[PDB]
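User: My notes are a mess, but here's the protein and ACP's SMILES. Can you give me a structure?
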Amino acid sequence: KFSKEQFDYSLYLVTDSGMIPEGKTLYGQVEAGLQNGVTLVQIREKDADTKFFIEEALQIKELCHAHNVPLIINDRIDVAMAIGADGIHVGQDDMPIPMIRKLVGPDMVIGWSVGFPEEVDELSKMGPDVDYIGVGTLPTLTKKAPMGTAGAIRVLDALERNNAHWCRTVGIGGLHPDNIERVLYQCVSSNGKRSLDGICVVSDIIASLDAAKSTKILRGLIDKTDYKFVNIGLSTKNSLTTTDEIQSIISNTLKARPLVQHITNKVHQNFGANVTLALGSSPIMSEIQSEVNDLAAIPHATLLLNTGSVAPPEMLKAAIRAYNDVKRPIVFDPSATETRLLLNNKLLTFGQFSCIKGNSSEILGLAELSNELLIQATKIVAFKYKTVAVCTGEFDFIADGTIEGKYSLKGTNTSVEDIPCVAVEAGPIEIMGDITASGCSLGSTIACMIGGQPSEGNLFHAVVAGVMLYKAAGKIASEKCNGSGSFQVELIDALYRLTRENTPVTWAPKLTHT
Amino acid sequence: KFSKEQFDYSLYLVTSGMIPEGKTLYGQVEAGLQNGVTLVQIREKDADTKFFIEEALQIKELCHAHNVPLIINDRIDVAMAIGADGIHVGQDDMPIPMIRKLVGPDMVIGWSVGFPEEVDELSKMGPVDYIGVGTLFPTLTKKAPMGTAGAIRVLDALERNNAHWCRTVGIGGLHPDNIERVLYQCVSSNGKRSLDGICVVSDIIASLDAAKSTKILRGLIDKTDYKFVNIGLSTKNSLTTTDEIQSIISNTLKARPLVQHITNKVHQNFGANVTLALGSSPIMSEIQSEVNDLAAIPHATLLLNTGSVAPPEMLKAAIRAYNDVKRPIVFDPVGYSATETRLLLNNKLLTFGQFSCIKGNSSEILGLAELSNELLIQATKIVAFKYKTVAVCTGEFDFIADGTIEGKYSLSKGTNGTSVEDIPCVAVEAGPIEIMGDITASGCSLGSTIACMIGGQPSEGNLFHAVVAGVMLYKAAGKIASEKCNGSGSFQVELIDALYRLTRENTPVTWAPKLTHT
Amino acid sequence: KFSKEQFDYSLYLVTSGMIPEGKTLYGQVEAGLQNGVTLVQIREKDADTKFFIEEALQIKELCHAHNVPLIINDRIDVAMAIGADGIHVGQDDMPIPMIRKLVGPDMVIGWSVGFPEEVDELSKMGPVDYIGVGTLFPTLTKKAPMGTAGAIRVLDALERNNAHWCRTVGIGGLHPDNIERVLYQCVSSNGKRSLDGICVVSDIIASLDAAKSTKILRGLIDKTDYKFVNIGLSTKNSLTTTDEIQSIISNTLKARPLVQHITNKVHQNFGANVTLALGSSPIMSEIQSEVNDLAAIPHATLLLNTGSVAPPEMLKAAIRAYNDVKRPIVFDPVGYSATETRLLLNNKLLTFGQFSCIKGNSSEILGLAELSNELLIQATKIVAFKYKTVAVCTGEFDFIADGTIEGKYSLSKGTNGTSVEDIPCVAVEAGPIEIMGDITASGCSLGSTIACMIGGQPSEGNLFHAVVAGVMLYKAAGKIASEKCNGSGSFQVELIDALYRLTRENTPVTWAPKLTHT
Ligand SMILES: Nc1ncnc2c1ncn2[C@@H]1O[C@H](COP(=O)(O)OP(=O)(O)CP(=O)(O)O)[C@@H](O)[C@H]1O
Ligand SMILES: Nc1ncnc2c1ncn2[C@@H]1O[C@H](COP(=O)(O)OP(=O)(O)CP(=O)(O)O)[C@@H](O)[C@H]1O
Ligand SMILES: Nc1ncnc2c1ncn2[C@@H]1O[C@H](COP(=O)(O)OP(=O)(O)CP(=O)(O)O)[C@@H](O)[C@H]1O
Ligand SMILES: Cc1ncc(C[n+]2csc(CCOP(=O)(O)O)c2C)c(N)n1
Ligand SMILES: [Mg+2]
Ligand SMILES: [Mg+2]
Ligand SMILES: [Mg+2]
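Assistant: No problem, the inputs look usable. Here's the predicted complex:
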């Protein structure tokens, strides 16, 4: 009675009978949903009696059809048939798809639980006879290892690579108002052609004291089309960064005197601090959870996040969340050891970053494995994490992956290949890499530059401005130094003087299009 | 029959469940009455109101035999029953006027007070006869421990409210290791009122030799002089002379003071270099087990920066380790007054010991003063006095106040005419040098310099002069570096060089900063 | 302002921690004041003496609105503070004269009393205004529960000491399942004084419908008639006539009463045979789960022997199961008064329910009377009255007293002129027959006979007449057997035969024993 094409995956509610609040029933929760924006319902009973199960399925089936929304069973095939369900959801260890299809006929919708690209290959070597997948666990407690959006993207990419046009996708696992826009936003195919088809919740709706309210919320999120994660203009700029724009950037940050919280390694503490206040803004080296919220609330707080520090992931997660809660900029600086690959992928799941900064090695790791290769790898990373990426080296490349904060359910009509990407070169300056925390301190610089921008500011321009400034100041130091030692002290001086006489026309570095 | 005026709160004993075997409540109370308790309160929060009465009638006779009144606790009826000399209650025990209604005047009524809001009621009631002030330090015998700073808030409310009838005693956590500091730094902001006595339970009641324990408290209480650091604390009206500054520097180069740094990461290296630029040696140890043997070293000195990763446990242990040995501590409360979290931590640290010097920027010093240039001078004097300390407020002008009053303390007097408003407060300035604030831990490194100067001081030295010596020096070195530098980066290397050069030739006659009365 | 005389202790409510959710102390107390509490005491053994005061002032107004005084607890100062109507204390709370000294006269003073020794002091004090008497039954809200027997000891001390000023209320464990028995059997030995009221906490405070709970207690309390067994209890001055005895036997042969035996092992078989000799049926079940359905059976009757292996748990359950259904219980306290152990067990059993008849030899009856022939007659009357029961004292003469007073009870009155000394007490004798005591459970089997006689009685029957009927019968059968026997062994088989023959032809005109007024 429902054709495969009539299934709206927008907000897909999946039940759990033993998590409902008192003075509330499954029928009661599933009805609020239906009146506030649920479009697909699945009945889940991993333990209940096969007969209670049936009586329950039948009563909710009436309900769903009342509002004209189908009903799915995960994953009782026989029950699904018995009650004549609209579809069924099975997983990687339940009943194989062919057997099922052989029992239910081609017209019923079959969902599969997928958390790996290999499973999309399998799905596609079965033809259009699997109709949707729920992408892995993005960490829930409703279960009894989470992959993040990065993990979702690999799965989306495998659909696109295999052109499994027939298969829809919903995200699931962990999903609440605090990660949902980030999930819609950064969960798109690399070619930008295919995004998530809808969103799955259990706890957010089922275990709610007000299901009607909780649903309206997820609705707002889902059918909204724009995610301002940072209070700085994300506008797309195809023109190079003019000397007036750079100059306006620097005026701004001297005036605002941004606050740049540094969570970072030991070696980068003093240097990173001095760079910051050489840029006429102030730095806190706080690593205390109790504090992060107060710090983020300060008028121009900016977080520079540097990996390999000793701080617990818990503190890092709360920090990232505090800055995102306040729409304040985070600059991320991260794969040489398995331990670091773990920790970094994990932080990348905690939040929405304003800018990601690394060298050739780190950017190629994040891109998922020359000079054109770097410009490719830099555009991937920017797009993957919807961020401004920066690849250091002789030439610094800077890609804008933000896409103006746009998300939809169709992807973004723009890809990993055609985002704006510029370059900044000032000749060879090998000595810049013979000094410790160089890229760390480029990070401090970027943060201060992003720190000072107002609502009408521009994110991309401020990162470029920051890269120019740092390169310009490294050219000047290389000329005035007598070795490593004096180079670093010349660098800070050069940064101090350059911004104190804010006159970009003068600087050495040359800004081109990649 | 005692009159309210005849009460001597000097050493106020509060009494059971925590008595040592082979000993009696009666025995201990007698031990204290013989070697020093001028007032006894009976506290039996769990006993049968029949046993309570028997116990109380027994001890009322013991007390009265030494001419010391007896005060009952959460119980106005036991106190009438046995004809007690007074009763003590809390904010949740029986309202005071009701109490007064049953017992009539001429019976002393004590109240438990931890906050100024309560002193306000105390006053809207007119002539409540004494109060025990909050629980200063964590006891084990409602609200959390507030330390002298919370005591002081309450003494000031009495003063503001002109509640002259009301006496005060301090209570909670009070032992030989904190009494003289509690008595020394618990005085009203106007120098006019201090604690009237000190109140103990576990220090005597739970004592194996309660006779010894009491004599110790008695000495502590009726002494008037708190030598917290082995360096002279005499008051100095005369500007610090070039001869003196030259003698400080000499003395520190010679002593070569061990300077233990407990400080954020950004300061570690800078501060270590400033330290051995001044011809002493730094140690960056954050290890509890070491602190004791570290501070035993001749001329040891502790610079304490807040924010520092260290657990409040080790911090308490260090502070006490230096106070235990009478070595100076320099406290720098980082923008503490910036987040509720740092406010908490510094306030707690400030209850752990006596600091020689407290150093901070304008924001911090206005915070600690429990909130221009006169205002900064008013604030610096408040901090100096509040914590009985040499406070330094850094800025274009550095301000240095001396709140130590020569280590003097008395009961109830409470100060030899010395208010928040008239401790000596000098000034140091060498023009605008904005660049000193464009390099990290400028103030932390100021702290290193002060520590070294204070560090090398002899028994006959002067704490105040050494703090000023070190601010002159640091400012003199900053003036020079700002001339020779080409930006932030080189400013810092010159700052160290300048300190290195300046102290290798004590010729302060040469330095650039101007030292003046405020 | 109430005068001591205006206090109505009828239903005395004592108040917190055990309140049902969605309900307030205030609400419950109001529920009770509306549907029956004539006095409220406030009890807050753990609250802050400030909250206590607030709570008490609030409820004093509630009370006073219904014209019922408020009494405070372990607290004489809260009670002066708020101007309470009285205060209640214990043996370990504040001594009474001190209390009187502070509150003056005109404030009611209650005392907790569990023992006569305490009533003695109460009296050596003269005019303490009321007492709550011990903790009768095990409560969950010092000394152990004493039941009515312990209450009675205290009422007698008041009487002996002529302490007329002092009122009494019963307290502890008091619920609908024991109130009418406590009120019925808690009267002085001279019939002149009974409880003045009944006192509850958990029955109302912890009630989901405290309005219902109170009305139930009110009915119970102001009724005057306790129908504990479904057989008439009218007082009988006239000897039991041969026509009557013949009607008892008829009635029991017809009813064919189920007689449940809980009894030592030596009696099981003998007692079972005596039972079906009398044309009824015995059951020897000692099983808790059965007791309820067993006693539901028409004409069910319970013979309860002490010593019996059974756990006091099952015994309590049985006793209550028969009282719950108003079926008779015959209690035989085996030489209980022989060992502290049996004394304990029987005293406890005696607190579990109401017995129709209590039967014992001389030793036992003198024990239960809480200690010749007149003496045995004085004792049998005491036991009968003490337990509000038909008591039988077996010997050469069997004595039968009737202490039931027709089920009547009142508050404080306390009896329609009926003392330990003038309940009807008859006598039964057929000469010396020493051989009746040379066979085991002679007395236990007497109990079987009584049970059957009582067993078959109708609604309109008479309890007393049936007990005498059965003693005549048993004695008549013993006379015959002693003639036909050749020693102990055959005596027993003839005793049964004689009972079998005697009841197959009710011709009591024929029997040998003589029934006479005492
Ligand atoms: N060979 C080179 N020529 C010119 N500039 C260079 C350079 N190598 C590095 N830089 C400059 O230094 C910055 C970052 O370079 P890079 O990322 O390779 O250092 P890094 O990542 O190893 C820092 P860390 O030591 O903390 O790991 C840029 O501003 C860049 O222009
Ligand atoms: N405008 C000015 N003119 C002259 N000296 C100045 C100055 N501003 C700061 N200084 C110098 O720098 C020191 C104090 O630094 P300040 O109190 O302003 O910041 P701060 O205490 O927070 C340092 P940190 O970076 O460790 O937080 C003093 O030695 C002082 O004389
Ligand atoms: N001297 C006597 N003359 C006539 N009858 C006597 C008698 N002594 C006992 N009896 C009869 O025996 C019964 C009471 O027994 P008794 O009270 O003397 O011992 P007892 O109650 O302890 C029995 P058990 O063996 O179960 O402990 C009565 O029915 C009574 O009439
Ligand atoms: C369509 C579909 N995709 C996946 C699964 C498996 N699954 C993975 S996570 C999760 C619990 C999340 O609850 P919460 O949102 O409260 O964290 C479930 C039920 C499924 N049953 N159906
Ligand atoms: Mg790097
Ligand atoms: Mg500072
Ligand atoms: Mg017997």
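Chain B touches chain C through 20 residues (CB under 8 Å).
User: Great, I'll file this with my notes.
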